[PDB]
Amino acid sequence: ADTPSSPSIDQVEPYSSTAQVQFDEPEATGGVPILKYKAEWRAVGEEVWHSKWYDAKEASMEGIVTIVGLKPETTYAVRLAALNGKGLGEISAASEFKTQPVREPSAPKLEGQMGEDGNSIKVNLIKQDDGGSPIRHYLVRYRALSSEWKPEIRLPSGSDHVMLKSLDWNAEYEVYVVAENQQGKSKAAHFVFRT
Amino acid sequence: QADTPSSPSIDQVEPYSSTAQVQFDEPEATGGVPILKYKAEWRAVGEEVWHSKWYDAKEASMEGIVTIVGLKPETTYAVRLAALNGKGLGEISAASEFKTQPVREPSAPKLEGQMGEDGNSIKVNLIKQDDGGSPIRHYLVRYRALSSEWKPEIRLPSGSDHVMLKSLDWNAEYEVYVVAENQQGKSKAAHFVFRTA
């Protein structure tokens, strides 16, 4: 039983302040299952590594790990390692990538939560890459699948959620949320649920 | 003083086994009043009757695509779109040819959660997505509270269309991954996060 060999980076898909890393697991687990992945990254030139741990089962199902806290139009070096019952294995070779220039924000992530009533719902906003400049506000569109769209809801950048009230009981609804900054509007995140 | 819309234009078609994603641009001229719906029409090579389906405009606009369903695997089709507004249906787009993929693993399932009134439970309805051209035999469900270890995989019996998560931790965030599996294999995982009260 030994620590895993090094995983290898397939490709990196960077945005403005974050990057998506696709990788292949180590060819030798070492005897015991891979528990976590550790990513190290820093701007080319810097001498201090930034790091983040990622759950292995999650990385396998998602198919990637996302690095955050980067700056626009900047060249970065990233590397990975795997942790098993024995410890951290060999670090991979570093892969270099350049983040996108300042642009429209990425789609935000939506997380449902029980609202004030059964015919209600709290849609939490899991903030995503803002594109390099502060998001100015969130645009929200929603409707019951059976009827017409409700007027658009505008939320300030500070908002951590959006509340949809007075909904029909046990009916299906769909929600779209757009994050907009100075550069433009992001793609729409869509969320479907049943009250 | 308004007029029906001009014709939409199909950029490209990304097909699967029994469905296809149609990427298109909205009509250049709306005509004067907001486009309300899009009408998609498709006909398999050889067949003579055009199948059709209405799609909500706003919905389609936000995703950039309309999804045609009920197609046969390994089959060549022709598809076209038209827009409807206050004045009526506009010009039909040119027809676009595409061929569905052969039978394979299912595409990631669609997840529709129904928050539990008890504040610590949830019903995840499995909305029908492309099955790859072969019936889904089992839905595999992996879930955990972001603060904890994964719970054992829950394999649902063929036929089931939902999974119920109860007795959940309070004030906790949960991630759920659902895999559709048929004769040819497992789909990539569909997922979503939710929070207990």
C-alpha closest to that of B139 among B175, B102, B191: B191
Contact A188 B125 (CB under 8 A): no
Contact B195 A113 (CB under 8 A): yes
- The two three-digit tokens of residue A121, written as one number: 């719902």
Nearest residue on chain A to B144, judged by CA atoms? A58
What is the Cα gyration radius of chain A?
20
- The two three-digit tokens of residue A26, written as one number: 């180590």
Distances (CA, A) of A191 to A126, A143, A178, A194, B4: 13, 11, 12, 10, 31
**CA dihedral of residues A103, A124, A35, A97 (deg, nearest 10):** 0
Write down the domain spans for chain B: 1-103, 104-197
C-alpha closest to that of B175 among B155, B138, B150, B154: B150
Can you name the residues that pair with B71 across neighbouring β-strands? none
Distances (CA, A) of B25 to A30, B55, B95: 51, 14, 14
How wide is the angle at C-alpha A149 spanned by C-alphas A143 and A151, nearest 5°? 110
Q: Which of B143, B164, B191, B192 to mutate to test the interface with A (most CBs of A within 10 A)?
A: B192
Q: Which residues of B touch A149 (CB under 8 A)?
A: 58
Nearest to A111 among B150, B194, B197 (CB): B194
Distances (CA, A) of B157 to A30, A163, B140, B142: 35, 35, 9, 15
Cα(A126)–Cα(A120) distance, integer angstroms: 19
How wide is the angle at C-alpha A135 spanned by C-alphas A130 and A138, nearest 5°? 110
Q: Which residues of B touch A172 (CB under 8 A)?
A: 112
C-alpha closest to that of A92 among A102, A78, A105: A78
Class of domain B104-197: mainly beta
Cα(B62)–Cα(B180) distance, integer angstroms: 26
Can you name the residues that pair with A97 across neighbouring β-strands? A76
Nearest residue on chain A to B148, judged by CA atoms? A55
Cα(B22)–Cα(B38) distance, integer angstroms: 12
**Within 13 Å, how many C-alpha atoms sit on residue A95's CB side?**
19
- The two three-digit tokens of residue A40, written as one number: 């190290």
Class of domain B1-103: mainly beta
Can you name the residues that pair with A50 across neighbouring β-strands? A41
Which residues of A sit within 8 Å Cβ distance of B? 57-58, 61-63, 109, 111-115, 118, 121-122, 124, 126, 141, 149, 170, 172, 174, 176, 188, 190, 192-195
**Contacts with B159 (C-beta within 8 Å, 6 or more apart), sequence order:** none
**Contacts with A68 (C-beta within 8 Å, 6 or more apart), sequence order:** A17, A18, A52, A129
DSSP string over B133-196? TS---EEEEEEEETTSPPPPPEEEPTT--EEEE-SPPTT-EEEEEEEEEETTEEPPPEEEEEE-
Which of the four CATH numbers 1.10.3720.10, 3.40.50.300, 2.60.40.10, 1.10.1040.10 does domain A1-102 have?
2.60.40.10
Cα(B64)–Cα(B17) distance, integer angstroms: 21
A103-195 fold? Immunoglobulin-like (2.60.40)
Q: Which residue's structure tokens are 């007029």?
A: B3
Can you name the residues that pair with A111 across neighbouring β-strands? A124, B193
Can you name the residues that pair with B25 across neighbouring β-strands? B9
**Contacts with B62 (C-beta within 8 Å, 6 or more apart), sequence order:** A141, A176, A188, A190
**Ramachandran quadrant class, B137 (left: phi over 0; alpha: psi -120 to 50; beta: rest):** alpha
Same fold flag, A1-102 and A103-195: yes
For residue A154, how far is the Cα from the chain centroid?
22
Annotate B184-193 with b (16+ C-beta within 10 A) or e (fewer): eeebebbbbb
Contact A190 B63 (CB under 8 A): yes
Phi, psi of B74, deg, nearest 5 = 45, 45
Give the H/E segment covering residue B30: none
- The two three-digit tokens of residue B38, written as one number: 């899009």
How many Cβ atoms sit within 10 Å of the Cβ of residue A116?
10
Cα(A43)–Cα(A93) distance, integer angstroms: 15
Cα(B37)–Cα(B95) distance, integer angstroms: 18
C-alpha closest to that of B65 among B23, B96, B12, B93: B23
Cα(B5)–Cα(A55) distance, integer angstroms: 50
Can you name the residues that pair with A141 across neighbouring β-strands? A176
* DSSP-derived secondary structure letter, A59: H
Residues after which chain B is discontinuous, using a C–N cutoff of 2.5 Å: none
Helix (H, G, I), strand (E, B) or coil at A109: strand
Q: How was this structure determined?
A: X-ray
Q: In this structure, are residues A193 and A118 in contact, taking their beta carbons and an 8 Å threshold?
A: no
Q: In this structure, are residues A2 and A34 in contact, taking their beta carbons and an 8 Å threshold?
A: no
**Contacts with A142 (C-beta within 8 Å, 6 or more apart), sequence order:** A149, A150, A153, A164, A173, A174, A175, A176
Could you give the maximum distance between any two Cα atoms of chain A, in Å? 61
Cα(A84)–Cα(A37) distance, integer angstroms: 9
Ranges of beta strands (E only) in B16-95 are 20-25, 37-44, 51-56, 65-68, 76-85, 88-89
Contact A112 B117 (CB under 8 A): no
Cα(B183)–Cα(B103) distance, integer angstroms: 10
Contact A111 B193 (CB under 8 A): yes
How many Cβ atoms sit within 10 Å of the Cβ of residue A168?
12
Q: In this structure, are residues B56 and B34 in contact, taking their beta carbons and an 8 Å threshold?
A: no
